[PDB]
Design a protein around this ligand. Structure first.
Ligand SMILES: O=C(O)C(=O)/C=C/[C@@H](F)C(=O)c1ccccc1F
Ligand SMILES: O=C(O)C(=O)/C=C/[C@@H](F)C(=O)c1ccccc1F
Ligand code: NA
Ligand code: NA
Lengths: 276, 276
């Protein structure tokens, strides 16, 4: 699946990193979520052609996901810092500067991490249902709704349950479910995933109010009102914690704004990027 | 001032009502705020030409304001119900149906009132810094920041203070200040204004969470993050209280989104109206 895009690979400080790209013009990097079996292609396949009409759009796979290396967790710590450094390494490896950057959930954590740590690489930032203020205590309190993703049972029904959790009223195709299930079944990513999620569960996915206020570039914060992974009040706290942030909230919409309301997602981000 | 627009007048159940209009196509009615000297022309003069390119745009003056009748408060109660009924009467008098409707502050109260009471007239509703959940207690607690408007001293500096309160970083022209000061000085509107504001102060500008959830048509809720009259957390409560509502929050922006970020205000509303 997704063979309409040419898989490319590049070395990021020894992590061999998969990505796709389309279009031309200024760079836009998209960072996928951390649910089981997720990657750039599957997260952003519908948005890619819209974005490609205006920008050079790039989706990569995070360390531990997709077709990027998933180093053995016997010797590799799957921490948020590892993701953030991977993203930074990716951006430099492609020779990119002043990028537009969108991150979904754990991808939002990672996009926000890079914006904080390597601001000189990023002109504009979009956080979409970004896990940037989910503390360990929040992981405990929201445990029931987070279970589908964070303690994924490895099965096919489990993958349908993940997708029904991430969305308000979306029926995925049998093909998307199969694609993600198959991806999730591979031993190396099953292992990297348990490490990723075990860390997240005890350290949360979190920056402090002061860190969030320290962002130096324009920010757009997006959220589905019905999101159960990063609830709307957490997205609202992000809008208020980041002084320069624009906030947009989508009704009748779960975590996956970009799949549930693809056209609306691209219009708002493209508008914010100065392209419409 | 504002003579680029032809003043028109129409009778609304015995209240002679001033309005302007421009463009053609589907109707869009704009409802101004309730600050001293405000009216349709002065509130929406910059937005009018943008909107006119796509719709038939109409701004009227609320009972007690502008060049609409300001019936003697010895015999007229300046209640929110009176405003809401005036708006409904206006919409029917022009022979309009399925309108788009935008209300600012007390105009938001009035737009929301009409949407609740005469939903069959209104297809889409925009609340911009709308006073739709400001209780009497809220009037007391936010009294210091509300003083410029609600206990306006009648002077010219007072009018500059009103405008500096409504905005984050806006210098109005001497002409706009003069226009509003002059308007505010007339005895009949000075009197209607004190009645309007005295009522508001003790009854608030308020619908209940259940009333807000009862809206039957699409809603877009807008707010400036720095608004001091209807603070952003009150606008956020509106987004959450109204299930179908889209929320948009503007950074570096006071109460007057439509004057501070005119192009951005029209793009978001026009997009929501299905015109872009
Ligand atoms: O799997 C996806 O495509 C996706 O976007 C899921 C997001 C998500 F579940 C993830 O990033 C996450 C992990 C732990 C806690 C909260 C999350 F929101
Ligand atoms: O005067 C204006 O142009 C305007 O938009 C002001 C809004 C406003 F002050 C008003 O509607 C109001 C009255 C009482 C309490 C809060 C308000 F927000
Ligand atoms: Na669901
Ligand atoms: Na100000």
């Amino acid at each position: 699946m997704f063979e309409q895009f040419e898989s490319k690979f590049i070395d990021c400080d020894g992590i061999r990193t998969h990505y796709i790209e389309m279009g031309e013009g200024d760079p836009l990097v998209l960072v996928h979520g951390g649910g089981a079996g997720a990657d750039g292609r599957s997260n952003f396949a519908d948005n890619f052609p819209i974005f490609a009409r205006h920008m050079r759009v790039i989706a990569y796979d995070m360390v531990g996901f997709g077709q990027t290396d998933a180093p053995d967790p016997a010797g590799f710590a799957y921490t948020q810092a590892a993701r953030t450094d991977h993203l930074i390494s990716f951006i430099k490896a492609l020779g990119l500067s002043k990028i537009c950057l969108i991150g979904n959930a754990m991808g939002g954590t990672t996009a926000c991490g890079a914006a904080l740590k390597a601001p000189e690489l990023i002109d504009r930032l979009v956080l979409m249902g970004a896990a940037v203020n989910i503390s360990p205590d929040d992981m405990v309190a929201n445990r029931d709704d987070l279970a589908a993703v964070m303690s994924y049972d490895g099965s096919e029904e489990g993958m349908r349950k993940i997708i029904a959790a991430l969305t308000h009223s979306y029926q995925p195709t049998d093909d998307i479910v199969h694609y993600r299930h198959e991806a999730s079944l591979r031993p190396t990513t099953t292992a990297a995933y348990k490490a990723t999620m075990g860390w997240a569960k005890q350290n949360g996915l979190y920056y402090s109010p002061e860190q969030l206020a320290s962002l130096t570039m324009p920010v757009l914060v997006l959220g589905g009102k019905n999101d159960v992974m990063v609830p709307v009040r957490k997205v609202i706290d992000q809008i208020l914690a980041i002084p320069q942030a624009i906030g947009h909230v989508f009704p009748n919409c779960g975590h996956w704004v970009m799949i549930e309301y693809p056209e609306e997602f691209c219009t708002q981000t493209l508008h914010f990027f100065g392209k419409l």
